[PDB]
Design an enzyme around this catalytic site. Structure first.
Site, PDB file in Angstrom:
ATOM      1  N   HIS A   1      -2.380 -41.186  40.046  1.00 13.81           N
ATOM      2  CA  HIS A   1      -2.543 -41.663  41.507  1.00 13.81           C
ATOM      3  C   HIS A   1      -1.568 -40.735  42.303  1.00 13.81           C
ATOM      4  O   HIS A   1      -2.180 -40.627  43.377  1.00 13.81           O
ATOM      5  CB  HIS A   1      -2.028 -43.184  41.724  1.00 13.81           C
ATOM      6  CG  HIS A   1      -2.907 -44.001  40.837  1.00 13.81           C
ATOM      7  ND1 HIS A   1      -2.320 -44.870  40.234  1.00 13.81           N
ATOM      8  CD2 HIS A   1      -4.156 -44.270  40.756  1.00 13.81           C
ATOM      9  CE1 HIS A   1      -3.138 -45.421  39.184  1.00 13.81           C
ATOM     10  NE2 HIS A   1      -4.363 -45.362  39.750  1.00 13.81           N
TER      11      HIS A   1
ATOM     12  N   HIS B   1       7.668 -40.359  45.553  1.00 14.91           N
ATOM     13  CA  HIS B   1       6.390 -39.826  45.316  1.00 14.91           C
ATOM     14  C   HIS B   1       5.873 -39.137  46.695  1.00 14.91           C
ATOM     15  O   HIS B   1       6.490 -39.597  47.702  1.00 14.91           O
ATOM     16  CB  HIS B   1       5.446 -40.787  44.492  1.00 14.91           C
ATOM     17  CG  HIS B   1       5.109 -42.152  45.478  1.00 14.91           C
ATOM     18  ND1 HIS B   1       5.979 -43.061  45.373  1.00 14.91           N
ATOM     19  CD2 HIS B   1       4.376 -42.087  46.515  1.00 14.91           C
ATOM     20  CE1 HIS B   1       5.621 -43.911  46.187  1.00 14.91           C
ATOM     21  NE2 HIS B   1       4.638 -43.279  46.981  1.00 14.91           N
TER      22      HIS B   1
ATOM     23  N   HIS C   1       1.779 -38.514  49.071  1.00 10.97           N
ATOM     24  CA  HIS C   1       0.463 -38.563  49.269  1.00 10.97           C
ATOM     25  C   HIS C   1       0.186 -37.372  50.258  1.00 10.97           C
ATOM     26  O   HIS C   1       1.175 -37.095  51.072  1.00 10.97           O
ATOM     27  CB  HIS C   1       0.186 -40.121  50.044  1.00 10.97           C
ATOM     28  CG  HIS C   1       0.667 -41.183  49.461  1.00 10.97           C
ATOM     29  ND1 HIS C   1      -0.125 -42.199  48.691  1.00 10.97           N
ATOM     30  CD2 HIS C   1       1.790 -41.716  49.287  1.00 10.97           C
ATOM     31  CE1 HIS C   1       0.771 -43.037  48.141  1.00 10.97           C
ATOM     32  NE2 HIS C   1       1.917 -42.710  48.753  1.00 10.97           N
TER      33      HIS C   1
ATOM     34  N   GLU D   1      -0.272 -41.220  55.358  1.00  9.44           N
ATOM     35  CA  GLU D   1      -0.748 -42.774  55.233  1.00  9.44           C
ATOM     36  C   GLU D   1      -0.287 -43.482  56.591  1.00  9.44           C
ATOM     37  O   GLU D   1      -1.236 -43.766  57.254  1.00  9.44           O
ATOM     38  CB  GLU D   1       0.033 -43.689  54.171  1.00  9.44           C
ATOM     39  CG  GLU D   1      -0.573 -42.994  52.899  1.00  9.44           C
ATOM     40  CD  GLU D   1      -0.349 -43.936  51.641  1.00  9.44           C
ATOM     41  OE1 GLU D   1       0.929 -44.658  51.455  1.00  9.44           O
ATOM     42  OE2 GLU D   1      -1.538 -44.177  50.937  1.00  9.44           O
TER      43      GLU D   1
ATOM     44  N   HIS E   1       7.311 -40.679  50.165  1.00 12.84           N
ATOM     45  CA  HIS E   1       7.844 -42.314  50.078  1.00 12.84           C
ATOM     46  C   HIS E   1       9.197 -42.218  49.086  1.00 12.84           C
ATOM     47  O   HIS E   1       8.837 -41.854  47.831  1.00 12.84           O
ATOM     48  CB  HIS E   1       6.732 -43.244  49.604  1.00 12.84           C
ATOM     49  CG  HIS E   1       5.815 -43.345  50.548  1.00 12.84           C
ATOM     50  ND1 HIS E   1       4.308 -43.620  50.289  1.00 12.84           N
ATOM     51  CD2 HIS E   1       5.882 -42.977  51.894  1.00 12.84           C
ATOM     52  CE1 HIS E   1       3.645 -43.687  51.505  1.00 12.84           C
ATOM     53  NE2 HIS E   1       4.558 -43.223  52.284  1.00 12.84           N
TER      54      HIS E   1
ATOM     55  N   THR F   1       1.147 -49.362  49.655  1.00  9.86           N
ATOM     56  CA  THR F   1      -0.069 -48.977  49.975  1.00  9.86           C
ATOM     57  C   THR F   1      -0.939 -48.776  49.103  1.00  9.86           C
ATOM     58  O   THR F   1      -1.998 -48.128  49.246  1.00  9.86           O
ATOM     59  CB  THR F   1       0.073 -47.506  50.881  1.00  9.86           C
ATOM     60  OG1 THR F   1       0.691 -46.630  49.809  1.00  9.86           O
ATOM     61  CG2 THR F   1       1.220 -47.683  51.963  1.00  9.86           C
TER      62      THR F   1
HETATM   63 ZN   LIG Z   1       3.472 -43.919  48.825  1.00 10.29          ZN
END
Ligand SMILES: [Zn+2]
EC number: 4.2.1.1
Length: 258
Positions: free
Chosen positions: A62, A92, A94, A104, A117, A196
């Site tokens: 992911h 991590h 995104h 996000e 994050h 999220t």
């Molecule tokens: Zn995250």
């Protein structure tokens, strides 16, 4: 099948297996800067990472996580909206397939290229798994990335991505200092929200920094070469692993600055 970011298993499908996807305090959200309110009651934010002890970097299918030793208070977040002490467990990102998308959270509907994050858990609950059964279990520090100059403190992460290309791969990642990923200013917005990704649990005090960090085009390109798939399966580039903004519902975003 199981969840991800594609047409057939992405954010618009998550509610079938995680009904809280439609709940009252989901994340991320759009931060409307004109409707956010300065809150003079917020205490100074303390990011205390001098003894941070990184362990490993993992591609989980992911995103990729850098994990830390959280058996003692070696890297903690306190102050701000927080009561008590929250220990850093992982960070991590995104990110997008194009520079104009990937974060996000959004700010006045503006999307950034990526979002970092730093995930923390409230020590009063003893372990991360107990923390995610509590409405003040987690605190996530979110930091926007924009493309511009290179971020030197990111480069060691970029350098090891070749060794975790596919789902399930991990590599030793010790002696990494997460202070190198912070912007100059700790000014922030804060609101109560959720994870999220599934399981989308409503346990998070979000602290989103106003100032983005800059990363180079070569650094973001290296994120985009990672794979969602495992070794020997067909290649699917790990890009666009972000959930779009969710309804604010009955929440007010607070600002630490005017
Ligand atoms: Zn995250």
């Amino acid at each position: 099948h199981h969840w991800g970011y594609g047409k057939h298993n992405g954010p618009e499908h998550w509610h079938k297996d995680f009904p809280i996807a439609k709940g009252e305090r989901q994340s991320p959200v759009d931060i409307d800067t004109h409707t956010a309110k300065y809150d003079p009651s917020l205490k100074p934010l303390s990011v205390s990472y001098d003894q941070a002890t990184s362990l490993r970097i993992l591609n989980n299918g992911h995103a990729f996580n850098v994990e830390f030793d959280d058996s003692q208070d070696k890297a903690v977040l306190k102050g701000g909206p927080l009561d008590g002490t929250y220990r850093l467990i992982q960070f991590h990102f995104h990110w997008g397939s194009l520079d104009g998308q990937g974060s996000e959270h959004t700010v006045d509907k503006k999307k950034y290229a990526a979002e970092l994050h730093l995930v923390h858990w409230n020590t009063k609950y003893g372990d991360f798994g107990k923390a995610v059964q509590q409405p003040d279990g987690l605190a996530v520090l979110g930091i926007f990335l924009k493309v511009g100059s290179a971020k030197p403190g990111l480069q060691k992460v970029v350098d090891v991505l070749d060794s975790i290309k596919t789902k399930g791969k991990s590599a030793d990642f010790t002696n990494f200092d997460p202070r190198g990923l912070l912007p100059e200013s700790l000014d922030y917005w804060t609101y109560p929200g959720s994870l999220t990704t599934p399981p989308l649990l409503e346990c998070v005090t979000w602290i989103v920094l106003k100032e983005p960090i800059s990363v180079s085009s070569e650094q973001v390109l290296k994120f985009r070469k990672l794979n969602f798939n495992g070794e020997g399966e067909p290649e699917e580039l790990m890009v666009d692993n972000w959930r779009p903004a969710q309804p604010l519902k009955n929440r007010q975003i607070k600002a630490s600055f005017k």
